[PDB]
Symmetry: C2
Subunit: 67 residues, 2 copies
């Protein structure tokens, strides 16, 4: 799904930064990938939406670090 | 209950008090950290435990930042 792919793009961006804050974001993103698969299998749209918002905020953080 | 989970649960209560989507995002991250840390402990992965301890530290700093509002 698009979630996993966007999250993996974000993971590659975090990997390029090579700092503890970027490692923390990378780990959170791996966890979100697994969480989002579980929520989809669960049929939990609320948790899916929560994880989409997490992805948006993690990406904004990555952007800031990339500045 | 382990000391990591206790630290994460206190941070989860503070995030619930903040009641904004950023705080809800942090709350969700902390729940996932608790489960990740239990798994890392079972595996004896000291490095992953340290990464998760740092994640908890950074999440708490974000929560602190919000709480001065």
């Amino acid at each position: 799904g698009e979630f996993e792919k966007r999250a993996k793009e974000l993971i590659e961006r975090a990997k390029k930064l090579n700092t503890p804050a970027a490692k923390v974001i990378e780990e959170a993103l791996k966890l979100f990938i697994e969480a989002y698969k579980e929520a989809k299998k669960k049929g939990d749209a609320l948790q899916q939406a929560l994880l989409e918002e997490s992805l948006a905020q993690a990406e904004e953080m990555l952007r800031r670090l990339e500045h």
